[PDB]
């Protein structure tokens, strides 16, 4: 059931691209009559990239949570995942902003936090948490996706050091990642603070992390700004308690940031 034959996967459209791979919308149509289910299929477009892609598959296959995109199987070559037609949270917030209130944003925040607490329990560092990588299952249910940069922490170390600087938009990186390429569950907490910012701006492009940080200010300039203690401003009409939580996520030192387990009840308290 977790083995999909290539001949049965029908190409429909492109969902995403980047980091030497692409995600396509396919129909898994073994009957060949266009009645099959839609699936999201990721493929690689080098020998290192092959190892990285195999690692992504092994990570996602071992994750079982209502708040993590579901692994469906492999085609022998491609990673088959469930397709969420509402798409990513970034675009969903822009389209439905007039219908989503603070309570709903707090509901999404709590669900992303629960997914992250679970990832951390699996020793998994996501490294690319952003609203573009969160999928909408329904009006009241989000899931974390895109494990393309995810790493598993060894049992005796709580962080990971990368040799070359990252290739992701720099506005979600923690200072220690910008300065020393150090990643941990605590740098995912920093990124989560930026996701809270994205949620409470409804992913408005005019005050997005890139637009606002660039206005405030390149990698050396952002590191300088952050080290001075400058941060993204509270989003328009943001509840004060939410902005206070973002600032805690953005503590200069990773050991001073709250854990996802500590953030969870704090978000649930604000929701109710």
Ligand X SMILES: *C(=N)N[C@H]1CCc2ccc(-c3ncnc4[nH]ccc34)cc21
Which of 9, 26, 63, 69 binds ligand X (CB under 6 A)? It is: 69
> Does residue 12 touch ligand X according to CB under 6 A?
no
Q: Is 21 annotated as a binding residue?
A: yes
Nearest CB to ligand X, comparing residues 15 and 270 = 15
> Does residue 195 touch ligand X according to CB under 6 A?
no
Q: Tell me which of 29, 101, 128, 256 is the catalytic residue.
A: 128
Which of 52, 67, 78, 90 binds ligand X (CB under 6 A)? It is: 90
Q: Is 259 annotated as a binding residue?
A: no
Nearest CB to ligand X, comparing residues 135 and 226 = 135
Q: Compute how many residues bind ligand X; rule: CB under 6 A.
A: 16
Which of 84, 105, 112, 226 binds ligand X (CB under 6 A)? It is: 84
Instruction: Check if 128 is active-site.
Output: yes
What's 165's DSSP letter?
P
DSSP string for 56-91: HHHHHHT---TTBPPEEEEE--EEEEE--TT-BHHH
Which of 72, 114, 126, 132 binds ligand X (CB under 6 A)? It is: 132
Residue of 216, 193, 198 whose CA lies nearest to 263 = 193
> Does residue 16 touch ligand X according to CB under 6 A?
yes
| Span near ligand X by CB under 6 A; candidates 44-52, 84-92, 198-206, 230-238 | 84-92
Where b means 16+ CB within 10 Å and e means fewer, 159-172 reads: bbeeeeebebebbb
Q: What is the token pair recorded at 14?
A: 């492109």
Strand order in the sheet with 78-82: 9-18, 21-28, 37-44, 78-82, 71-75
Instruction: Count the Cβ atoms, other than its own, within 10 Å of residue 85.
Output: 9
What's 1's DSSP letter?
-
> Does residue 150 touch ligand X according to CB under 6 A?
no
> Does residue 148 touch ligand X according to CB under 6 A?
no
Nearest CB to ligand X, comparing residues 131 and 263 = 131
Q: Is 19 annotated as a binding residue?
A: yes
Nearest CB to ligand X, comparing residues 130 and 174 = 130
Instruction: Report the nearest approach of ligand X to the CB of residue 10 (Å).
Output: 16
CA atoms within 13 A on the CB side of 263: 33
Q: How far is CA 120 from the centre of its chain?
A: 14
Residue of 129, 260, 143 whose CA lies nearest to 183 = 129
Q: Is 74 annotated as a binding residue?
A: no
By CB atoms closer than 10 A (0-12, 13-18, 19+), residue 35 is exposed
Distances in whole angstroms, Cα of residue 50 to Cα of each of 53, 127, 201, 228, 246: 5, 19, 37, 40, 36
Which of 80, 145, 178, 232 binds ligand X (CB under 6 A)? It is: 145
Which of 8, 10, 12, 15 binds ligand X (CB under 6 A)? It is: 15
Cite the annotated binding site by residue number.
15-23, 42
Annotated binding site for ATP: 15-23, 42
Catalytic residues: 128
Contacting residues toward ligand X, per CB under 6 A: 15-16, 23, 40, 69, 81-84, 87-88, 90-91, 132, 135, 145
């Amino acid at each position: 059931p977790t083995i999909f034959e290539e001949r049965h996967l029908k190409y429909i459209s492109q969902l995403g691209k980047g980091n030497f791979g692409s995600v396509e919308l396919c129909r898994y149509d073994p009957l060949g009559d266009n009645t099959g289910a839609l699936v999201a299929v990721k493929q690689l477009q080098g020998p290192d990239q092959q190892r990285d892609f195999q690692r992504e598959i092994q990570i996602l296959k071992a994750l079982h949570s209502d708040f993590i995109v579901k692994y469906r199987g492999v085609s022998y070559l491609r990673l088959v995942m469930e397709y969420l037609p509402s798409g990513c949270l970034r675009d969903f917030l822009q389209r439905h902003r007039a219908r989503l209130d603070a309570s709903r944003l707090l509901l999404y925040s709590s669900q992303i936090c629960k997914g992250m607490e679970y990832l951390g329990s699996r020793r998994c560092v996501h490294r690319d948490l952003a609203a573009r990588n969160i999928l909408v299952e329904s009006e009241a249910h989000v899931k974390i996706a895109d494990f393309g940069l995810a790493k598993l922490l060894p049992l005796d170390k709580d962080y990971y050091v990368v040799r070359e600087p990252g290739q992701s938009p720099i506005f979600w990186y923690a200072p220690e990642s910008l300065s020393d390429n150090i990643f941990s569950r605590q740098s995912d907490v920093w990124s989560f603070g930026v996701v809270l910012y994205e949620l409470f701006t409804y992913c408005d492009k005019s005050c997005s992390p890139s637009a606002e940080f660039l206005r405030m200010m390149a990698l050396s300039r952002l590191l300088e700004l952050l080290e001075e203690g400058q941060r993204l401003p509270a989003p328009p009409a943001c509840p004060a308690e939410v902005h206070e939580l973002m600032k805690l996520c953005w503590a200069p030192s990773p050991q001073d940031r709250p854990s996802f387990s500590a953030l969870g009840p704090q978000l649930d308290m604000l929701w109710s």
